[PDB]
Amino acid sequence: AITCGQVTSNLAPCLAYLRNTGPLGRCCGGVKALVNSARTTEDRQIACTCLKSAAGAISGINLGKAAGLPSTCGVNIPYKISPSTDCSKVQ
């Protein structure tokens, strides 16, 4: 089943980039994998909420880099990675 636990494991390098402190490293590769588990409508919603939660979990989180993370790691996700956009209503 889909779960934030699996999603946050791939974010390990992103979590550091989100805080404007550690390099992206494999953040793009991790997210790239998630994208595939983030396009069947619900899989997508699970990732959005998990990521939103991930950003909210980070302490010195940079909202601009979070929202611009998928732009930095060019990926085909139809939602921005930020604790603000809702995903449950994404069709």
Side-chain angles (χ1 to χ4, degrees):
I2 13 62
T3 326
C4 186
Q6 297 168 59
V7 169
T8 191
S9 298
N10 299 45
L11 299 168
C14 310
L15 299 183
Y17 170 56
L18 296 188
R19 208 194 308 181
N20 187 27
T21 201
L24 288 88
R26 295 169 171 178
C27 175
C28 305
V31 180
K32 188 75 177 186
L34 300 173
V35 179
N36 305 306
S37 191
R39 287 299 323 281
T40 11
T41 296
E42 301 181 299
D43 295 271
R44 172 180 67 197
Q45 291 165 40
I46 305 304
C48 300
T49 186
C50 176
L51 296 152
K52 158 168 195 291
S53 299
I58 302 315
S59 53
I61 189 262
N62 186 301
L63 298 160
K65 300 184 174 301
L69 158 61
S71 184
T72 305
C73 290
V75 275
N76 182 206
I77 57 182
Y79 58 90
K80 39 170 66 54
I81 303 187
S82 52
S84 304
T85 190
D86 163 73
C87 204
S88 67
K89 312 298 176 297
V90 173
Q91 303 284 79

